[PDB]
Amino acid sequence: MALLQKTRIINSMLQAAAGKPVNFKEMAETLRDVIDSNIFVVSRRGKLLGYSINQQIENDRMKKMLEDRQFPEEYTKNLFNVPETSSNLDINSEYTAFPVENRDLFQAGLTTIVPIIGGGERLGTLILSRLQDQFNDDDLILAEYGATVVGMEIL
Amino acid sequence: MALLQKTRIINSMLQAAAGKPVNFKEMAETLRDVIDSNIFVVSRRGKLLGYSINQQIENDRMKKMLEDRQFPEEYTKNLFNVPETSSNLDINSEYTAFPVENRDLFQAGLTTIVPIIGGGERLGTLILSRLQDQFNDDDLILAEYGATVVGMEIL
Numbered sequence: 440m441a442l443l444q445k446t447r448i449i450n451s452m453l454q455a456a457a458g459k460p461v462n463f464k465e466m467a468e469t470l471r472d473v474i475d476s477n478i479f480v481v482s483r484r485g486k487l488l489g490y491s492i493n494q495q496i497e498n499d500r501m502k503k504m505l506e507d508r509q510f511p512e513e514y515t516k517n518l519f520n521v522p523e524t525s526s527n528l529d530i531n532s533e534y535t536a537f538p539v540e541n542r543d544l545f546q547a548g549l550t551t552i553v554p555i556i557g558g559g560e561r562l563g564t565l566i567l568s569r570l571q572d573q574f575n576d577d578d579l580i581l582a583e584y585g586a587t588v589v590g591m592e593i594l
Numbered sequence: 595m596a597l598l599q600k601t602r603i604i605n606s607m608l609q610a611a612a613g614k615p616v617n618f619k620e621m622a623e624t625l626r627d628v629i630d631s632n633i634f635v636v637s638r639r640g641k642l643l644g645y646s647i648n649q650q651i652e653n654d655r656m657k658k659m660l661e662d663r664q665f666p667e668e669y670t671k672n673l674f675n676v677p678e679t680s681s682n683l684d685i686n687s688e689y690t691a692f693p694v695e696n697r698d699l700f701q702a703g704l705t706t707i708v709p710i711i712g713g714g715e716r717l718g719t720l721i722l723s724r725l726q727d728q729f730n731d732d733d734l735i736l737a738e739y740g741a742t743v744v745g746m747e748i749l
């Protein structure tokens with residue numbers, strides 16, 4: 440589908456949701472639907488504000504992070520070192536959203552890191568991951584739209 | 595410039611502005627910059643919440659509307675009859691944003707009507723107008739992004 444269709448999908452969701460008690464789970468599921476990727480909305484200190492999983496993986500440490508709603512400390516800290524969107528980061532990147540013990544299995548795993556920003560403040564990070572299919576401009580548009588509005592709905 | 599560049603321009607503006615006292619003038623100027631068109635954010639009852647003019651026109655009734663920050667009653671009412679974005683509406687459309695006494699002069703004037711919606715409620719209308727150049731998907735994406743976030747910043 441065309442980009443305008445996908446943006447319309449986010450827009451209808453935003454239009455109906457404003458105002459109800461903010462729903463990051465819903466935003467993550469929407470982005471997952473239009474970007475076709477795993478979605479994690481991660482706070483400054485690693486708290487999962489929302490996520491939506493597009494691939495079930497059999498890694499226990501990963502399943503725990505989602506049950507805990509908490510990403511690792513070091514990994515989460517290091518996300519501040521990416522000041523601007525950085526896309527198509529491969530399995531060997533320190534920023535990969537796939538678990539490192541499974542690099543062999545997820546050799547084609549791609550990660551996109553999107554700073555969530557609001558008031559000149561890095562409020563969090565929106566992480567996108569999936570297998571094999573390179574992220575393109577359209578995915579970035581949708582990703583950044585979502586990160587911007589999440590940055591707003593965080594306030 | 596690519597769409598992703600233009601969306602980045604709106605995004606930086608939104609990112610710095612949240613939160614300061616909402617600024618519809620700034621939003622209108624931004625959209626004008628990226629869509630290259632006149633921009634009017636019109637309330638349910640015709641109040642100009644914001645505008646940004648890309649073409650100065652010599653029509654006094656129009657200059658008054660902007661000084662008053664109020665569009666006409668009938669015209670404003672009839673905007674509810676457009677439930678979804680309707681673009682590239684010509685000079686002879688009842689929805690035209692050009693003054694009707696100057697139809698001859700503005701024969702190539704095109705208008706796009708974008709419902710501003712929030713909570714299942716039509717909150718207003720975002721109107722785009724310009725001469726000669728047809729609106730395309732990219733303009734609509736930018737227009738609808740802006741209308742959606744205006745619908746939110748109205749709440």
Ligand SMILES: CC(C)[C@H](N)C(=O)O
Nearest residue numbers: 514535536537538539
């Ligand atoms: C999955 C993510 C948090 C990181 N690459 C890790 O392996 O812990």
Ligand SMILES: CC(C)[C@H](N)C(=O)O
Nearest residue numbers: 669690691692693694
């Ligand atoms: C400009 C607008 C409000 C309308 N077409 C009019 O002529 O009054």
